[PDB]
Amino acid sequence: KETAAAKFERQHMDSSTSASSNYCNQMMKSRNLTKDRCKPVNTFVHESLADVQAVCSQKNVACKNGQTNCYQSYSTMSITDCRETGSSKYPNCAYKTTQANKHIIVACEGNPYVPVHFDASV
Amino acid sequence: KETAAAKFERQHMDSSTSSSNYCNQMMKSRNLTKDRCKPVNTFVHESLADVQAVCSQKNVACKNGQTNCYQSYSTMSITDCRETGSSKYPNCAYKTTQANKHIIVACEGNPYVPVHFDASV
Numbered sequence: 556k557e558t559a560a561a562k563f564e565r566q567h568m569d570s571s572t573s574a575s576s577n578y579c580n581q582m583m584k585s586r587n588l589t590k591d592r593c594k595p596v597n598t599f600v601h602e603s604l605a606d607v608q609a610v611c612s613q614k615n616v617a618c619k620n621g622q623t624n625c626y627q628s629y630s631t632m633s634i635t636d637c638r639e640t641g642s643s644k645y646p647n648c649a650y651k652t653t654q655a656n657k658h659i660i661v662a663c664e665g666n667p668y669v670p671v672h673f674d675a676s677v
Numbered sequence: 678k679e680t681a682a683a684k685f686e687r688q689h690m691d692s693s694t695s696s697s698n699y700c701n702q703m704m705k706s707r708n709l710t711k712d713r714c715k716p717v718n719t720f721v722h723e724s725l726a727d728v729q730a731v732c733s734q735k736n737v738a739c740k741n742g743q744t745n746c747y748q749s750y751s752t753m754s755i756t757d758c759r760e761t762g763s764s765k766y767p768n769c770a771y772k773t774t775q776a777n778k779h780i781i782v783a784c785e786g787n788p789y790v791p792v793h794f795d796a797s798v
């Protein structure tokens with residue numbers, strides 16, 4: 556029902572803000588990343604969908620899993636990293652919000668060829 | 678530094694596949710407006726494999742007089758980006774034109790791949 560592309564959007568897109576200390580707490584919950592467990596690490600990207608989708612035609616790089624279908628953004632993008640705290644205990648998942656400007660690396664698949672996985676920021 | 682092959686892909690490859698704002702968005706996203714507005718740039722809308730294949734097509738002289746240039750046997754989907762007359766950095770402005778033309782690239786290295794966009798014809 557939920558496509559890989561849609562799941563990527565749900566997990567990783569937040570175009571609506573350009574960059575709150577309680578951002579991650581709220582967003583990890585609202586995007587259903589704390590439902591079955593506390594997802595430990597997750598990145599949100601504050602750019603347009605078109606800008607993130609465009610990365611699939613940018614710098615081809617090796618994926619961390621050894622596949623070859625990963626792409627690094629030529630420009631830095633505004634991102635927020637969410638990382639689970641040490642004192643976090645499901646179901647009260649708690650996170651540190653870290654904002655950065657970094658290049659992103661995504662895995663792309665499909666026709667159309669679109670992001671399905673967030674591999675890293677550099 | 679960036680390899681020549683990689684620079685070619687950044688500057689000239691867009692296998693994604695069109696707004697009149699396409700060039701404005703692309704020349705920015707590929708870092709072609711950073712210090713200056715690059716005045717003229719062509720993007721190719723074919724697979725990387727198709728463009729790399731041009732290195733085994735029609736051998737021609739390059740505009741610099743070297744003879745490692747190759748013309749595509751087929752026409753390809755391209756977008757020509759050319760700065761407007763009134764464009765002034767840092768607000769770089771481009772006219773986008775879609776076309777279907779043969780491309781000419783310089784090839785080098787191992788693997789033997791495009792390292793320079795010479796012309797569309």
Ligand SMILES: Cc1cn([C@H]2C[C@H](O)[C@@H](CO[P@](O)(=S)N3C[C@@H](CO)O[C@@H](n4ccc(=O)[nH]c4=O)C3)O2)c(=O)[nH]c1=O
Pocket residue numbers: 596597598599619672673674675676
């Ligand atoms: C590194 C990183 C990851 N993530 C998200 C994307 C994914 O939803 C999730 C896990 O991605 P990875 O860390 S690339 N991921 C892939 C996973 C199989 O699904 O396998 C994991 N793995 C692999 C080897 C290993 O030793 N340990 C481990 O946990 C790592 O975390 C994210 O949003 N931002 C990031 O910066």
